[PDB]
Amino acid sequence: TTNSFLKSILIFTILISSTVLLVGGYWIFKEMAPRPKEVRSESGEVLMTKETIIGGQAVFQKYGLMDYGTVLGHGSYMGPDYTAEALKVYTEGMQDYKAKADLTDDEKSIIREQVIKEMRKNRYNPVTDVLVLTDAQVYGLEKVRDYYRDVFTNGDGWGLKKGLIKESDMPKANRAWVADSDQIQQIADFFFWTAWLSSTLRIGDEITYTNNWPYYEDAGNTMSFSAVWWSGASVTILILFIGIILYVFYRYQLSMQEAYAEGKFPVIDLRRQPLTPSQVKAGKYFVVVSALFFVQTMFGALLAHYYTEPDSFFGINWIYDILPFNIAKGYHLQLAIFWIATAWLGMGIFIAPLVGGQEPKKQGLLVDLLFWALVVLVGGSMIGQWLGVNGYLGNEWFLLGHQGWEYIELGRIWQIILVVGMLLWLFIVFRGVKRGLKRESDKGGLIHLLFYSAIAVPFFYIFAFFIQPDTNFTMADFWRWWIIHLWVEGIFEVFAVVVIGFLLVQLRLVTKKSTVRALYFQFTILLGSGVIGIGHHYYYNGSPEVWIALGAVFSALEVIPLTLLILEAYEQYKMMRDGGANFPYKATFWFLISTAIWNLVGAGVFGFLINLPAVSYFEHGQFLTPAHGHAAMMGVYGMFAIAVLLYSLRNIVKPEAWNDKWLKFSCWMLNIGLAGMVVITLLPVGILQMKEAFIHGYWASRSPSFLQQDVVQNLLLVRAVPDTIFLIGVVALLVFAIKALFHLRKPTHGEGEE
Ligand SMILES: CCCCCCCC/C=C/CCCCCCCC(=O)O[C@H](COC(=O)CCCCCCCCCCC)COP(=O)(O)OCCN
Ligand SMILES: CCCCCCCC/C=C\CCCCCCCC(=O)O[C@H](COC(=O)CCCCCCCCCCC)COP(=O)(O)OCCN
Ligand code: HEM
Ligand code: HEM
Ligand SMILES: CCCCCCCCO[C@@H]1O[C@H](CO)[C@@H](O)[C@H](O)[C@H]1O
Ligand SMILES: CCCCCCCCO[C@@H]1O[C@H](CO)[C@@H](O)[C@H](O)[C@H]1O
Ligand SMILES: CCCCCCCCO[C@@H]1O[C@H](CO)[C@@H](O)[C@H](O)[C@H]1O
Ligand SMILES: [Ca+2]
Ligand SMILES: [Zn+2]
């Protein structure tokens, strides 16, 4: 019964938090805004069907518009937020209709006040799944309908391609998820719906389906009491647990303990370290991620450029033609997850034999096969997205094209091959680790924790399948976050962490006992806050008001594990020094230290800058999000993948040919460029955008007009300095990765024994 209490706590933590998530997931499904079978006029004339709404949404996904603009605050920022934009047109129309822009202030005052009392009342009948909206509202739906035809025909005057939506892209009828009916009448309908629920009070409630989001006086949308109350409450509870957790941490020495006495640093003679065929093979895996990282960055360089030159890349043409923003955005995200994720899969391949003590038969065969599987998935899924967004696909867009969800842009069949790949990956890990699991008595020991977490990789991605074109937006978004917030960060904050403990225990740098106890404490505080903390993504996506409290409180608690960081980085810096200038893993530790600090700064402080519900009310879907997004994503996960990538490359390259000079330069260039792009550009624009929404309405902050202000542009223009500096750091890595195959070692043992 070695770490019994810690296990109960962890198990209990996972059990309780999972329940709350599921219950809250149920409350959403049951309280989210409805998609009436028929929405119609006072004359009884139907204008909308649940099937239309589902269709509009479908074409929105079909054309990957979530990689251009947003809806309900989620998606890209080049374009506007259709919900807020559609809401304005619809609101403006209701004004004109009742206006029968020239009235007196004393006059426009009366009308705008009239449209307020009229549009915020729920006219949906639960007994009968049908909604009826006044004439003043139908006239508004018209302006909305007209507005977007113009848009999806003439363009939006900023980055969006002309007449991108065309019937010729899909069959006469019998269209996959989109309905038999004009496509750009469905979209306008989808947008109108999100705008409908964002401005209409919840039945019996006093605020709307989105807790009064977006901010917009003319529609009566203003900050809710819960948004302000939970801002204070969440932080007070955080203060309460910081003290509590700190005490627990201090009293049980729940951290790694050095395994060596003063001056007795362990010898790391890499020359006499067993190496195997599957490991050397996993070595080239890293050069590819290094390459994908290179392209991923490039697309980022392209996206940033488009904020200054909307329809061209320095006058050139094909670029905005074949690689427009939405498409480029998709690849940027897709490749980020791809290169970071597969860096750890490789790391898994690499240590697998070490855990077992030998090379599994056909390991190199399986490894090599896994290799050409992703390479296909990647090259393939991307081709798919191009064909899909462009229309050179039929009803195969959802299966092979662009699924239409930011972060989840690949097609369903592309997702299927993904899981099988991970499943295969899992098998490969298990094959090499299997015997370790057998030697390890304690079923909750290092190797078991390493294996349990390894399986969460493929498994947890399966929740994505609860998502498909006809799913209600807020409910589908609910599941999307299980992948973005729980999965990606489950790949990294659990699997990676146990992998590092394993490595440090192997190098004989920290006691094994010390390490597993530490992992238990972290996992419990990590899952104890983060599982429910997922809810801060549900503040305004249409979810019930209860998630404002749940999300605010639990995401705030996510900061606790983060503070036991700047000081963990130091313990690591410390042991890095205990190893002289001949310490083999310098480069690795510099990136390790870097991820801890960015975890405090990028996720901890920049993430919190936008976490308060009071703040997020205005900020949600603005530049501060990407500010935090890069600081955390690249700062934490990118650096971590790199640390592990260099760690493996070190056990593979011939020492004599190794030089971490270039890596020092990379580390410096990457860190400086990341901070610079955040601080010099993303942050100041984020503030302006939030101020602009606070004073004129959120619609004004998401209009291309905002991006056009000279002040914004200049801020946008100087992003090039730090962006170029960051770029240089990645090429230096790439160059070091590539010309690293030229100095590889060859397997020491085969299917033998270490
Ligand atoms: C909006 C603000 C966000 C700020 C986020 C900043 C993130 C902090 C970055 C930390 C990088 C840590 C890198 C490892 C540091 C520990 C090991 C180390 O520094 O050893 C250095 C070489 O290190 C190295 O060669 C490692 C490279 C160090 C490069 C640091 C550049 C980061 C600048 C961050 C501020 C813009 C040896 O020389 P010394 O000056 O004696 O080392 C002591 C200094 N730590
Ligand atoms: C909504 C979802 C939220 C996220 C939930 C998943 C999070 C995944 C990430 C990390 C999970 C780490 C889980 C570690 C739990 C360890 C519990 C445990 O081992 O307790 C053990 C028995 O374990 C056992 O006998 C086996 C039980 C533990 C392993 C079961 C499989 C778990 C894999 C789950 C991944 C999908 C008690 O007895 P032992 O000490 O092992 O045995 C005697 C030792 N002398
Ligand atoms: C030369 C460096 C880079 C540049 C110039 C850059 C630029 C950009 C731009 C312009 C966007 C637009 C988001 C939008 O308007 O919708 C973006 C989003 C994003 N980037 Fe990058 N990027 C760079 C590096 C990276 C790296 C290294 C990672 C991590 C592996 C990363 C992760 C992301 C993520 C997750 C988003 C989406 C966040 C959001 O939409 O709020 N980026 N980036
Ligand atoms: C290493 C850990 C973390 C990573 C990689 C990360 C990454 C990201 C990314 C990429 C986004 C943009 C999502 C999108 O495109 O819509 C985002 C949004 C967000 N993150 Fe994090 N995050 C981390 C930790 C945290 C923490 C600790 C907090 C709590 C303070 C937090 C709060 C938020 C919030 C509130 C948003 C939503 C912004 C909006 O709706 O406008 N994050 N995060
Ligand atoms: C979320 C925080 C969970 C904290 C769990 C602490 C479990 C402490 O457990 C205790 O650790 C002592 C050594 O420090 C041992 O001597 C005790 O026998 C053991 O019961
Ligand atoms: C600090 C965290 C406090 C969380 C309080 C959650 C209170 C949930 O309260 C429940 O909300 C449901 C809708 O989601 C309603 O249908 C239920 O009737 C209501 O009791
Ligand atoms: C993105 C640009 C990547 C450039 C990588 C250049 C890698 C050069 O690599 C070098 O090439 C030489 C022959 O020219 C060989 O003799 C060296 O052994 C080899 O390391
Ligand atoms: Ca986004
Ligand atoms: Zn989150």
Short mmCIF file of N, CA and C in Angstrom, two decimals, residues 52 55-60 62-63 149 152 164-171 175 177-190 397:
data_model
loop_
_atom_site.label_atom_id
_atom_site.label_comp_id
_atom_site.label_asym_id
_atom_site.label_seq_id
_atom_site.Cartn_x
_atom_site.Cartn_y
_atom_site.Cartn_z
N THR A 52 -32.65 24.64 -41.57
CA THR A 52 -31.98 25.77 -42.20
C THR A 52 -30.78 26.13 -41.33
N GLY A 55 -28.10 24.06 -41.53
CA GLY A 55 -27.46 24.20 -42.83
C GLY A 55 -26.55 25.42 -42.87
N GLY A 56 -27.06 26.55 -42.41
CA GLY A 56 -26.26 27.77 -42.39
C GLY A 56 -24.97 27.46 -41.68
N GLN A 57 -25.10 26.92 -40.47
CA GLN A 57 -23.94 26.55 -39.69
C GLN A 57 -23.01 25.68 -40.52
N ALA A 58 -23.59 24.74 -41.26
CA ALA A 58 -22.81 23.82 -42.08
C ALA A 58 -21.98 24.46 -43.18
N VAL A 59 -22.52 25.48 -43.83
CA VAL A 59 -21.77 26.13 -44.90
C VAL A 59 -20.66 26.98 -44.27
N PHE A 60 -20.94 27.48 -43.07
CA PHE A 60 -19.99 28.28 -42.31
C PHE A 60 -18.78 27.40 -42.02
N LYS A 62 -18.16 24.49 -43.69
CA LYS A 62 -17.73 24.10 -45.04
C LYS A 62 -16.65 25.06 -45.59
N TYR A 63 -16.91 26.36 -45.54
CA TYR A 63 -15.96 27.37 -46.03
C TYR A 63 -14.89 27.81 -45.00
N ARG A 149 -25.48 38.43 -48.19
CA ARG A 149 -25.47 37.99 -49.58
C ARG A 149 -24.43 38.88 -50.20
N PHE A 152 -21.00 37.55 -48.85
CA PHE A 152 -20.56 36.32 -49.50
C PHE A 152 -20.70 36.34 -51.01
N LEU A 164 -17.36 33.84 -52.54
CA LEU A 164 -16.74 32.58 -52.17
C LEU A 164 -17.78 31.48 -52.09
N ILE A 165 -19.02 31.84 -51.73
CA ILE A 165 -20.09 30.84 -51.65
C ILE A 165 -20.83 30.70 -52.98
N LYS A 166 -20.85 29.48 -53.50
CA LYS A 166 -21.52 29.22 -54.77
C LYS A 166 -22.16 27.83 -54.82
N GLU A 167 -23.41 27.79 -55.29
CA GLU A 167 -24.17 26.54 -55.38
C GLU A 167 -23.38 25.46 -56.12
N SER A 168 -22.65 25.87 -57.15
CA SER A 168 -21.85 24.95 -57.94
C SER A 168 -20.85 24.16 -57.10
N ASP A 169 -20.62 24.59 -55.86
CA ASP A 169 -19.68 23.89 -54.98
C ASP A 169 -20.32 22.62 -54.45
N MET A 170 -21.65 22.59 -54.47
CA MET A 170 -22.39 21.44 -53.98
C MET A 170 -23.53 21.04 -54.93
N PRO A 171 -23.83 19.73 -55.01
CA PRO A 171 -24.89 19.16 -55.86
C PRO A 171 -26.15 20.00 -55.94
N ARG A 175 -27.75 17.61 -50.72
CA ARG A 175 -26.48 18.14 -50.22
C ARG A 175 -26.25 17.62 -48.79
N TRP A 177 -24.80 18.07 -45.46
CA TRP A 177 -25.34 18.57 -44.20
C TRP A 177 -26.08 19.86 -44.42
N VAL A 178 -25.81 20.48 -45.54
CA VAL A 178 -26.48 21.72 -45.85
C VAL A 178 -27.82 21.36 -46.49
N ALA A 179 -28.81 22.21 -46.28
CA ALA A 179 -30.14 21.93 -46.81
C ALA A 179 -30.37 22.26 -48.28
N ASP A 180 -31.47 21.70 -48.81
CA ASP A 180 -31.88 21.94 -50.19
C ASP A 180 -32.43 23.35 -50.07
N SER A 181 -31.72 24.32 -50.62
CA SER A 181 -32.13 25.72 -50.53
C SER A 181 -30.87 26.55 -50.68
N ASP A 182 -31.02 27.78 -51.18
CA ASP A 182 -29.88 28.66 -51.35
C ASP A 182 -28.96 28.59 -50.13
N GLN A 183 -27.66 28.46 -50.37
CA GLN A 183 -26.70 28.35 -49.29
C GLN A 183 -26.48 29.63 -48.49
N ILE A 184 -26.37 30.77 -49.17
CA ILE A 184 -26.13 32.02 -48.45
C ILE A 184 -27.38 32.64 -47.84
N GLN A 185 -28.44 31.85 -47.74
CA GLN A 185 -29.68 32.29 -47.12
C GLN A 185 -29.69 31.49 -45.82
N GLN A 186 -29.01 30.34 -45.85
CA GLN A 186 -28.90 29.47 -44.67
C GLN A 186 -27.91 30.12 -43.69
N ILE A 187 -26.75 30.53 -44.21
CA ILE A 187 -25.72 31.19 -43.40
C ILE A 187 -26.31 32.38 -42.66
N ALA A 188 -26.92 33.28 -43.42
CA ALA A 188 -27.53 34.47 -42.85
C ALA A 188 -28.50 34.05 -41.76
N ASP A 189 -29.07 32.86 -41.92
CA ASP A 189 -30.02 32.32 -40.97
C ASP A 189 -29.30 31.79 -39.74
N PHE A 190 -28.17 31.14 -39.97
CA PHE A 190 -27.38 30.62 -38.87
C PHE A 190 -26.89 31.81 -38.04
N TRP A 397 -16.84 16.99 -48.02
CA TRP A 397 -16.15 18.05 -47.29
C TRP A 397 -16.00 17.72 -45.82
#
